[PDB]
Amino acid sequence: GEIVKTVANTVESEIKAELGVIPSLNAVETGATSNTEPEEAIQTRTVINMHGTAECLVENFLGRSALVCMRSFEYKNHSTSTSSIQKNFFIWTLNTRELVQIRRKMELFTYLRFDTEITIVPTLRLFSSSNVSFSGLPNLTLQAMYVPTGARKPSSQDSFEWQSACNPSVFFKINDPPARLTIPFMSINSAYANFYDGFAGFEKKATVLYGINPANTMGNLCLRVVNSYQPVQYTLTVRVYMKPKHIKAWAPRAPRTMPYTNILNNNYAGRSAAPNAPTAIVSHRSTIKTMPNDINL
Amino acid sequence: GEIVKTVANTVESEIKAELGVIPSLNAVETGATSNTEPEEAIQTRTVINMHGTAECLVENFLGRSALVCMRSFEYKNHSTSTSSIQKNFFIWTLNTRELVQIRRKMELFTYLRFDTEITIVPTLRLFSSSNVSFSGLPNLTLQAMYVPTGARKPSSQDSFEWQSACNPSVFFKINDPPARLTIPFMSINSAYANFYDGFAGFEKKATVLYGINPANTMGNLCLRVVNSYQPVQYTLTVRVYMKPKHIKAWAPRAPRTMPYTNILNNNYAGRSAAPNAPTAIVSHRSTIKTMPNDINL
Amino acid sequence: GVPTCLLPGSNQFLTTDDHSSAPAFPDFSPTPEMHIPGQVHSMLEIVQIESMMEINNVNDASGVERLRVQISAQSDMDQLLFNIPLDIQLEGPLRNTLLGNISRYYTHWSGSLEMTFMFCGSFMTTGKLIICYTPPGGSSPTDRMQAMLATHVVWDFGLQSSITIIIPWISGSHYRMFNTDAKAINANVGYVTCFMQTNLVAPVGAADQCYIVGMVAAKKDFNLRLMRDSPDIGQSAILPEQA
Amino acid sequence: GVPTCLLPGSNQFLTTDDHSSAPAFPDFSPTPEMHIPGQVHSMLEIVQIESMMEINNVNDASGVERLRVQISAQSDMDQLLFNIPLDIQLEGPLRNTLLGNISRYYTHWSGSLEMTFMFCGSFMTTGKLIICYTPPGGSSPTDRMQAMLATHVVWDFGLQSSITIIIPWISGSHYRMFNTDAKAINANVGYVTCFMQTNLVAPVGAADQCYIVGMVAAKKDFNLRLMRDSPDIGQSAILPEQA
Amino acid sequence: QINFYKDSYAASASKQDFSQDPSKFTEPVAEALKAGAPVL
Amino acid sequence: QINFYKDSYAASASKQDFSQDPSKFTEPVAEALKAGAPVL
Amino acid sequence: QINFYKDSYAASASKQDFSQDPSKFTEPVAEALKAGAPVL
Amino acid sequence: QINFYKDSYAASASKQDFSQDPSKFTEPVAEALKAGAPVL
Numbered sequence A, B: 001g002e003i004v005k006t007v008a009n010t011v012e013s014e015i016k017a018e019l020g021v022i023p024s025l026n027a028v029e030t031g032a033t034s035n036t037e038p039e040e041a042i043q044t045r046t047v048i049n050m051h052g053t054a055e056c057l058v059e060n061f062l063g064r065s066a067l068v069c070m071r072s073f074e075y076k077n078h079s080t081s082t083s084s085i086q087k088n089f090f091i092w093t094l095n096t097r098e099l100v101q102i103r104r105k106m107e108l109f110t111y112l113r114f115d116t117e118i119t120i121v122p123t124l125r126l127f128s129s130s131n132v133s134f135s136g137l138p139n140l141t142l143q144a145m146y147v148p149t150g151a152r153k154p155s156s157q158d159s160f161e162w163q164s165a166c167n168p169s170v171f172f173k174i175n176d177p178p179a180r181l182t183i184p185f186m187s188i189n190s191a192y193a194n195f196y197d198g199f200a201g202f203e204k205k206a207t208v209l210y211g212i213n214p215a216n217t218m219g220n221l222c223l224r225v226v227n228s229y230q231p232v233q234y235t236l237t238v239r240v241y242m243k244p245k246h247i248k249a250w251a252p253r254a255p256r257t258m259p260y261t262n263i264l265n266n267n268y269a270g271r272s273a274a275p276n277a278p279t280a281i282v283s284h285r286s287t288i289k290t291m292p293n294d295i296n297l
Numbered sequence C, D: 001g002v003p004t005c006l007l008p009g010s011n012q013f014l015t016t017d018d019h020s021s022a023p024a025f026p027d028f029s030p031t032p033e034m035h036i037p038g039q040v041h042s043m044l045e046i047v048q049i050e051s052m053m054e055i056n057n058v059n060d061a062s063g064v065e066r067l068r069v070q071i072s073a074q075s076d077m078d079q080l081l082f083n084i085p086l087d088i089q090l091e092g093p094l095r096n097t098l099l100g101n102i103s104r105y106y107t108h109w110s111g112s113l114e115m116t117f118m119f120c121g122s123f124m125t126t127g128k129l130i131i132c133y134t135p136p137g138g139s140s141p142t143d144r145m146q147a148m149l150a151t152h153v154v155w156d157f158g159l160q161s162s163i164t165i166i167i168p169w170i171s172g173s174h175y176r177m178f179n180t181d182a183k184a185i186n187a188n189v190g191y192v193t194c195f196m197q198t199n200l201v202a203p204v205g206a207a208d209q210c211y212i213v214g215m216v217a218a219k220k221d222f223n224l225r226l227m228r229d230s231p232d233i234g235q236s237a238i239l240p241e242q243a
Numbered sequence E, F, G, H: 001q002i003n004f005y006k007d008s009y010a011a012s013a014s015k016q017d018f019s020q021d022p023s024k025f026t027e028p029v030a031e032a033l034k035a036g037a038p039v040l
């Protein structure tokens, strides 16, 4: 294990006709990748490469803020003949699989240990009714409440589970900067697992699903409009962004090829034809001797 | 190479009638500019000039914030009978040629290496409809997403390319200060080139255009209204400003004379008559012996 | 109070910003760190791992057929056997590789590549191949006389079952771009071509139609820049629980 | 928390502000610096380079005709040959120069100018000219007796083909302004005039109608201030891709 | 790193660790392969 | 210069470099021209 | 703790006191119980 | 006190002066009264 701030330098190489030395030949059967250097495969010049590697660090590769949740509910009076339930909120059931870019990028490793910075971005639209005159978006107070595993969830906007005496909650308005906080590495294990070759229950029943991990039960995010209902219908759209920090990554995986279909498992249907079809990942060319983008003069 | 914080001082000079010394005569054929000093052309006094030069530094000359993009789209419901495309965004295809003041100023050098500070200034107007009652501009959330070369571009406001898990994106509202960030020196080469005497493709076809540089393929800026459509039509105008920082400049050019016509090449039509006509750059005077602004008493 | 001026960039959310934030679980004790083998510190470690290429990406090969190249005894000499496009950004043999998939998360790249070919015929089957890397400028070679003039390695089958060809970093610019225009000077790497040096010779007891598997990796002089969302994966809607 | 008061100038975008900003590409490695010849550190280096003047900016000269002054053998004596307005801000011979174009990006200027004239007749053609810089106050001289009383140089043609006249910094104020009013005390530099000292004498074998090319540059005592958008370039719309 | 908060996990992106050991994945063999040597 | 961010390219306008070598453009001649001398 | 205000009670959450004496509640007996001993 | 401004009168509430002399108001007598003594 050596320090690599810049890519390897190239050393000047000479003609070499030596018996018993075959640097260009390797045995792939050992499981070892070819160790052949350019210096010993061709005649090379001295090159002092000052290309930096900091952008290919797993901290930089995974430590960008990515969307992990998009939920939209109608902000209005949901009350009817006999309901008494205001329903101006949503519950998510925390996960990192709903959006494929962060999922596929996280799924390039088996295990990840990171503290996560979260950023919530709310947006309002007036609901296009029969008689609706627009004149501006109310500066509503929102409450995002993390309900951990085994805590009572809210059933209404007006519920008293919103007390949040011990539940972590953040209050933030529409016209303010998007809410932000850091959640620590909060697994019962020493790393998060993107794949579980097993079951999360002690029973052998169908109801006990394959792939579900007994460390991904992370609880729920409950977000409400704190303001009581307006005289008109609004649509609140909430976007939650995840930025992994202080990242450790283990056991790199084969990248996902087929499009995801759900968040409970890694099943696939594949696309009808190449690319990313079950029988053809790379698009077809005419023959093994055909260059599809051959430069013609 | 010497340090020049203040302009050159003037030294007192005397009468000089010396054979073999002709400081006022030069040979222009050598390619060298005249080396004749005022001290040796006329009788001068001692002057201690304390005029500073910091304002004529290329850092100061180019390192002002200049407009590089103005795009306006209609913020409304673009949906029809069968579209399902919201179209509340634009794509720019990054460049520095659309606006002539920054173009002509940058085009005074062949090569530039600078890190660039960008500032995005959004503005809304209500669309003047048949029945439109104004009462104020919604504090909309905007997303500017840099889509690098070879990345999937968004086709709609509601597209999932906006994930931006690895694409650099900035979220900023209307009533906030204008969004700002620094893009680094991001050329595949050691400097940006304002002119390319060549082609960017290996083929010799018409489709391969002259002047296009294979280092100006900088990707695209995709900017969206994050908020879903309002009940009324708004017009969002976005202004992007560029401030070069940490600037190195090489091979100063002859300044542009004819008005620019496009961003793909440096072609010209010229103005019908002087000034800046193809056959007359400077305006006409009656004769070579005529002073047009002659002071009369 | 502290004299204050809110600058441009105030109240903005940048997805690539690097700032400390409010801890939601104050004084929370995270699980003690435990040693797990195969810890990755850099993406440049993964692109250095060999991965198979779909050299046989043709509309007659299905599944595992696409990762092997059928090499046969020829009733001819000097003939071209197979080609490899080096357009990582475009749908080609290198796309679905560790190099391809992870480099495709970036826009700029520089450095030498290694391509290793494993011969999978019989111990009794012999042969000599010539694999050639043609730097860009003109057309892909179809004659061995033209291909031999570029960077190449002559491959003798034997106890060492595999050969490496180093595709050396030969470009005017410090970096190349993963661009949608393959024929662009910024993007084009050139061509890899394989010809028969002698022939494939198999005795009656051994099969005449053998196979070659091609692997590609990056060398230690390899770099990536300007991270981007990979075009490998797409999404039309929020992924549901079931469907 | 840190005690804070948002001052006037909070939430403002000033196009001339000097502040650090959020890096969009975190830990991005820019291309290594490479030596390129002709590196410019100051705009004052470019204004010191000679550039041709349109002395013949008349409605009968087209293109390259405008950058040369037709000097002929005179059937007279002491006669004026040509004039040069020194109004950089106004449409005059100095506008389309390196001095002009780059100084025209500023509002204030100070320092001595050099104007070099190259004679382009025959080796056998002789002559003596007198070029005079008249400081401002009154009318431009039309008689040599009046012009000779100002700063001047007498030019003998020979092996050294060019002469310099230093237009020396002679002003009450430390700076002059690039003002639209030419007759303003803040703007006016005065006059440059060229008269015949003797005559142009060419033998029968040589052409009688020769040419002079005038160049102008700044000296090391030259300064510019108060940057502005140049009036040289205009725009009626966003420049399209094609038209 | 800077961190204005009490907890250490609240801090910004961690100080760049440029340690690389690709041998974990590229040469994970009991007996090391010598460069130029026939690796049988 | 100040810079509140990790990257060096994020810093403000660079510290004034007053180095000038106009000879690159004004006297780019193999044999230097001497002041007052006939330069032929 | 930090505190930007004059009063000490205005300060943030106090510096963690990890002192524990559960014997107050778990063994509040005049004669101490010895581990392993018959406590009668 | 702190004061971010040039003038001294712009400063916050002045540093607590705990000096007390209630004798000014409680025993403002030429000849001091002795404790326990008949004060006639």
Ligand SMILES: Cc1cc(CCCOc2c(C)cc(-c3noc(C(F)(F)F)n3)cc2C)on1
Residues within 6 Å of the ligand: A068, A094, A095, A096, A116, A118, A144, A145, A146, A147, A167, A168, A169, A170, A181, A183, A192, A193, A216, A218, A221, A240, A242, C024
């Ligand atoms: C797998 C896997 C799962 C994780 C952790 C994801 C973090 O989950 C969250 C999210 C996305 C948001 C909040 C949250 N947002 O707001 C609040 C608050 F308001 F309660 F503070 N909490 C809390 C957690 C644990 O990391 N790997």
Ligand SMILES: Cc1cc(CCCOc2c(C)cc(-c3noc(C(F)(F)F)n3)cc2C)on1
Residues within 6 Å of the ligand: B068, B094, B095, B096, B116, B118, B144, B145, B146, B147, B167, B168, B169, B170, B181, B183, B192, B193, B216, B218, B221, B240, B242, D024
């Ligand atoms: C020629 C030439 C081209 C350049 C660089 C111009 C910078 O281009 C931009 C611009 C103008 C804006 C953004 C940008 N604006 O916002 C975002 C973000 F939101 F994605 F962060 N990126 C990114 C780049 C590379 O310098 N010389």
